């Protein structure tokens, strides 16, 4: 009586694990080369279905991470190698001793000062201390002037050049220099070869979205209770393409996120305690960074005929520094409250036991926030900021770190290890002129780690890759498979 | 981005859709957009067209979609229902123990309950088509 | 919805014996099944939750396990005080409760 | 903790109300639901509805979709039912519960199906008869 | 190749010999010439088959030959024609102001006067098929 | 697939054994295994997908299977008899000097004796389908 | 000095390079077969069809 028959055109699907197409609006380089134009269609429809969603175990987020990284690698690949520059450089001794690259025992320094010196210093748009790049506590940049002999395309002819390095970019040979001209090399040359990131990478924003190929579709959670891992999502929204993603790579605080909503959300890894905390846009949190001084850039033709961008500054500017604006105190209070009330949190009772904290260790890639402003990477020591936003009783943090400020000192570094799991060291060309960037702050990257009902430790993290799971994350890719089978009586003849 | 299939997903098995033309529409939208970009890339970049990995990823994506389209058409041709909605094959349902609730279950819910039957059913449907085919051969010969 | 049923509907044994109740579902429940113990004239109380954990304050003689469409409640040694109606609750969706079973005392 | 209250006898076609007070705690406490179930004489338990303490969101048994309403009042530490269009079959013991979630590594959202949820705490129960 | 599509050009709208089968054979010609050349290149160059611009241009035309074929079959299916000589429809012509002179105008002249309608018509033809599928589904339920 | 299709070879031309389902099942089995590998490769090698000789070769074998499928289906559609076994076309056999021995010769032997007729026949079969369909157009108008 | 000079080592220009273009399937080449074709001609009355140049 009941035969299988074939039902074609059936509204059903299964998990897909395939590549997606990218589409963009910025078509200056990589866009025209690799991506479809953005169609402008951001519409979506809802279904009365239940589906399982997981931000960490996703194919959509996995492609975002690997694709951003891969387009970086294919952009740098053809640029000039700097191994011809790994020669002894002759550096000003007072500068290498002053900033700790080399040693001297003839400085016999001794300081007597007031110990009751902690101050509170607030800055905002309407202030001359910002316009003139001089706020209480800001020091000089720490740039070291070094000379070296470099050969261009004439081969049997060479010239000496003036290159000023940031102090963190040099190693410097130590011991028995009783004169001048210390002997220095680039910090990461010898274990590897440094390549210059010549094709304007990071000088502008990279934004793109993913589109499903024919036969595939994207499902998204449209709940408010989505916490990264949700086995039964009741509000499932269907679309053909994802929202636009901002491929921003910064540690501690994520900038310019697309998921900027009037709500604090905390995604949680299902199997771990690593989380991405969005911030409530209601408070207009913003970070305005400046790199003081007017730079000169001097292209140098080296051996192969490719050009390297040198930095003959011949000056002594103030430190790069950053100013935090918006209602930071209140945005942080909401984060602490959101954690206390969260489904996966079984820790403390009060927000007076919940604190933001730096990761420990002596490793600069975690102890300092890294922010990319138009091509120059800016590591920033944030103790002043944290003391202020948390309104901490500092007291015993040692005299330079005991201040409460809404700005922090920072220091430019040109040889940066790639953010992805590569380990490659690249050189960032300097930008000419002065630099200013004004970013929104949309997320906090941190682990939540408590072992008792007192002290929660929101520990800032440097895994930049976790940020891509806030940009997407709520998407699932599915295959439409419209063939069904079901018992029925209607067989042919 | 027609989304015609997903649109009736939350209703019931005995209720809606059974759409065939939506797959053609989906493929057409896909092909046209890929062609527009493929014509556009050479306007600025002619050398790096398949040489670098982004072009191999876009190629694999397109090939997979084409194979998928043809995969369903080939399966239907074997069963004969290229254009037959319900098809009307003669293979008995495996057992009376697994029966749909046409007015309570959706196709999504249902199909996930017969995944272990499909493995045997596809082969059985093809075998039935083969014997019918042999019978038709002899009738046409006569 | 999920139809949750129970068996035996009525069972008994002596004080000191081993007693078990089985709950079944028409749909799988991942693990989200609760057990409640209701004595006549009183509100039900939670006995076991999430198909595996004993509710604090409940004697250690009560235990259970289960997954999918089959779950079990066990009393390792029946007490004279355990006569009660035991109910299963699924909370995978819009909780519905099963019919309940009775344990009497012999 | 949970003390219910209301008329023992109501008439057909009237609206029944039941109000439960929370003692030693409030109705605004985080991550709890104030729920009600019914137990008709001689029958098992039936869930009827749920109001979430941190929001104005409710969840009701579809069979009473147009008949049941739940609200809370933080100034009284009370929550209550309204059941309209009463009939003979609505005779039941009405009970309250807190439905505490098991917070932790197994709770992803305070939703049915996404968190262990159980009625650890129960009230006393009010028997309501619908009659002329 | 053959170009029967152009051979009959100029004959007027009340045309003879609309060589439908011409698209199938142009596909076959494409596949054969490109496949033979790809098999030939490795005789001297086995690595740089797609990795030099000539092979990205030749791959693009091979993939495109498949896609162009499929776009037409898919559009025809979208409009209800498994095979289309004329495959009559249920969609009325937009207005009486645009009627061809079957014994004067050619297809080249005619089509270039109705590009406007083709954009609106394509959608109408697809909509007609959607309703027809819905009607078949209701008949299946009955 | 299992290639059981050729199992009958040596049986003689008239010994039934023809089938319309063998190629669909061979292709379908192929597509599933090949798609699984396309998606498996990235677990170890994500950059060099078609940047190598083996990458290009896998492209070539996936594409060849598709082109072949389409060449045959396209030719049958041109003749119209996609699902008709013997098809029953109206084109007369070229001459009496080329007649098969249905109970002596095999299909392998037979086809190699008529390779030069296919060259004239394909076109005749295509025209016959066109003539039949244009006559149906005139009948629908009437 | 401004650049790097590369040697044209693979016999380039040592012999003639001659080739013709062919349209892909579905495409065709049209040609003017007039004597009045002066590079720019809005209405060419003698139009010749071929598959290759
Ligand atoms: C389409 O895509 C979606 C989205 O990606 C897919 O959904 C996902 O599918 C996965 C595969 O089924 C699920 O993962 C699996 O979950 C199983 C069940 O986990 C629970 O029970 C565990 C033990 O309980 C047993 O006994 C009870 C009795 O009642 C039974 O009911 C159970 O079935 C078991 O038999 C329990 O340990 C689990 O808790 C731990 O994991 C969860 C993960 O969410 C954490 O949240 C918990 O905090 C906890 O983590 C701790 O412990 C683990 C070790 O177990 C550590 O790794 C952590 O770091 C931490 O310390 C749950 O309560 C698991 O049994 C199963 O594990 C087995 O198989 C894997 C291989 O896959 C092995 O590696 C394991 O070692 C083990 O043998 C696995 O985890 C996803 O949850 C599900 N996601 C969502 C959002 O729903 C969907 O399937 C896809 N569909 C298709 C067709 O592709
Ligand atoms: C398939 O391929 C074929 C082959 O390529 C395509 O055919 C070509 O299609 C082109 C696009 O349509 C045509 O070019 C356009 O011609 C327009 C008309 O030009 C004439 O009129 C001009 C002004 O007259 C106005 O008023 C009269 C009133 O009677 C109206 O009838 C007119 O329509 C206008 O409204 C006049 O200035 C022109 O003369 C100049 O251009 C011609 C070009 O052939 C020269 O021969 C002349 O010597 C003269 O050149 C001088 O001036 C121009 C600037 O105008 C300078 O650049 C020169 O160096 C020089 O100093 C004609 O008499 C133009 O209006 C139109 O230009 C507008 O649009 C373009 C954008 O497309 C803008 O960039 C302009 O700025 C302006 O707004 C354009 O030139 C080709 O003629 C035609 N080729 C052939 C052989 O027929 C075919 O379309 C393709 N099909 C498809 C589907 O893709
Ligand atoms: C978070 O998001 C925010 C935004 O919401 C990000 O901040 C923005 O980042 C933008 C991208 O870097 C930046 O845009 C640039 O602004 C420059 C300054 O413009 C000022 O003057 C104009 C008037 O002329 C005002 O309208 C404007 O408001 C400012 O006051 C422009 O000069 C830049 O233009 C260049 O790029 C565009 C690209 O479309 C070109 O069209 C244009 O011609 C310029 O081209 C130069 O650069 C390219 C590099 O590809 C060269 O190839 C080209 O030859 C030119 O190079 C010369 O000039 C440069 C100096 O600019 C010199 O270095 C070089 O050596 C050459 O001599 C562009 O428009 C936004 O202003 C900025 N906004 C804010 C508020 O910060 C933020 O970074 C994100 N945060 C994080 C962490 O990622
Ligand atoms: C976009 O996001 C912003 C937040 O970033 C939202 O702004 C908040 O909106 C809520 C809701 O209106 C406000 O909450 C209310 O605050 C009142 C004032 O409280 C003061 O005193 C208490 C101590 O008792 C302090 O803790 C507090 O900080 C204030 O100084 C309360 O009286 C209100 O109480 C009522 O609701 C609570 C439940 O939440 C009940 O328990 C009470 O009994 C009573 O019924 C309430 O708490 C909040 O203050 C706003 N924040 C800010 C910074 O302005 C926007 O609403 C949101 N936008 C949109 C469109 O949703
Ligand atoms: C995220 O971190 C928290 C805090 O470290 C983890 O919570 C801790 O999880 C372990 C394992 O679940 C608990 O230890 C065990 O708890 C069970 C249940 O009480 C007990 O029977 C065992 O004997 C053991 O004590 C631990 O108590 C718990 N700590 C706290 C304070 O919550 C959490 O599991 C981590 N999440 C993930 C997914 O990694
Ligand atoms: C690359 O160079 C670093 C550092 O350079 C050496 O040490 C400096 C302090 C200075 O004196 C330079 O002139 C020297 O060339 C090497 O790192 C050192 O390795 C030794 C041995 O393991 C260890 O004891 C030191 O503490 C390390 N010092 C620092 C600053 O890291 C590194 O090994 C070199 N890599 C290669 C491949 O040679
Ligand atoms: C980022 O914000 C700063 C203000 O904090 C902008 O700086 C001002 O720019 C105007 C010109 O448009 C000058 O007249 C003001 O004197 C500047 N202010 C200060 C404190 O220097 C800056 O232009 C903004 N963005 C960028 C990319 O520069
Ligand atoms: C997603 O939720 C918002 C409310 O937060 C609603 O306005 C929107 O319509 C929903 N999207 C869909 C497709 O239903
Ligand atoms: C993701 O889920 C699948 C099961 O669907 C499992 O096999 C795989 O190991 C999971 N991946 C990770 C990173 O947990
Ligand atoms: C570096 O700059 C100084 C001026 O400060 C100049 O005297 C010196 O010659 C320059 N050296 C080189 C190598 O350009
Ligand atoms: C410095 O000089 C002392 C002798 O006074 C010698 O022992 C030591 O090795 C020297 N160090 C270096 C780095 O040359
Ligand atoms: C500094 O360098 C000069 C050579 O340019 C040298 O004569 C002088 O002695 C050096 N200074 C010291 C302290 O040795
Ligand atoms: C889906 O939900 C909407 C309300 O958002 C309702 O109007 C519609 O009827 C529901 N569809 C189905 C099939 O239940
Ligand atoms: C018989 O029914 C059971 C329950 O649905 C199913 O698991 C089993 O595969 C079925 N057997 C056959 C031959 O279909
Ligand atoms: C759907 O469920 C109801 C009970 O709620 C039942 O009466 C009805 O027969 C079921 N429908 C089917 C097709 O089994
Ligand atoms: C084309 O022109 C020739 C004369 O050269 C004429 O015999 C033929 O009929 C014309 N064909 C058409 C379609 O106009
Ligand atoms: C109506 O006819 C005019 C020509 O007179 C044409 O331009 C217009 O596009 C036609 N409209 C429709 C809907 O066909
Ligand atoms: C073709 O044009 C002639 C005038 O030369 C006219 O008499 C005839 O009716 C027209 N044919 C059609 C189909 O309109
Ligand atoms: C196509 O339809 C739109 C309305 O959706 C109308 O404005 C437009 O004129 C129509 N195009 C033609 C050629 O009639
Ligand atoms: C092939 O030979 C075997 C005997 O070895 C015989 O049984 C079989 O029928 C033969 N096959 C054909 C097609 O004649
Ligand atoms: C007639 O038969 C002979 C037999 O060998 C064959 O060569 C010739 O091509 C046939 N003529 C046709 C098909 O016109």
Author numbering:
A (entry chain C): 23 to 515
B (entry chain D), E (entry chain B), F (entry chain F): 533 to 674
C (entry chain I): 1 to 106
D (entry chain G): 3 to 35, 35A, 35B, 36 to 52, 52A, 53 to 82, 82A, 82B, ...
G (entry chain A): 212 to 264
What does the paper say about this structure?
SIVmac239 infection of macaques is a favored model of human HIV infection. We also present the high-resolution structure of a recombinant SIVmac239 trimer in complex with nAb K11 by electron cryo-microscopy (cryo-EM) and find that it has many features in common with the HIV-1 and SIVcpz Env trimer structures solved to date, along with some distinctive features. Overall, the topology of the trimer closely resembles both the chimpanzee SIVcpz (MT145K) and HIV-1 Env (BG505), with the V2 and V3 loops forming the trimerization interface at the membrane-distal apex. The two features of the SIVmac Env structure that are most distinct from HIV and SIVcpz are the V4 loop and extended V1 loop which both fold back on top of the gp120 core.
Our previous attempts to solve the trimer structure via cryo-EM failed due to severe orientation bias and trimer instability. However, by complexing the trimer with K11 IgG, we were able to overcome these issues and obtain a 3.4 Å-resolution reconstruction of the complex. The 3D reconstructions revealed three K11 antibody molecules bound to the trimer. Of note, the SIVmac239 SOSIP trimer that we used contains a K180S substitution in the V2 loop to increase the binding affinity of the V2 apex-specific HIV-1 broadly neutralizing antibody (bnAb) PGT145, which enables its use in competition experiments. If we map the distinct SIVmac239 features on HIV and SIVcpz Env, the extended V1 loop would clash with the conserved HIV high-mannose patch glycans at positions N332 and N295 and the SIVcpz V4 glycan at N412, while the V4 loop would clash with the gp120 outer-domain glycans at N363, N386, and N392 on both HIV and SIVcpz, the latter two of which are highly conserved among HIV strains. To shield parts of the extended V1 loop, SIVmac239 has two glycans at positions N146 and N156. The FP is buried against the gp120 core, unlike in HIV where it protrudes outwards, and SIVcpz where it is buried even further behind the fusion peptide proximal region helix. SIVmac239 also features an additional disulfide bond between residues 194 and 206 in the V2 loop. The K11 epitope-paratope interactions are largely dominated by sidechain-backbone hydrogen bonds between the CDRH3 loop and gp120 residues, as well as hydrogen bonds with the unique SIVmac239 glycan at N37, which interacts with both the HC and LC.
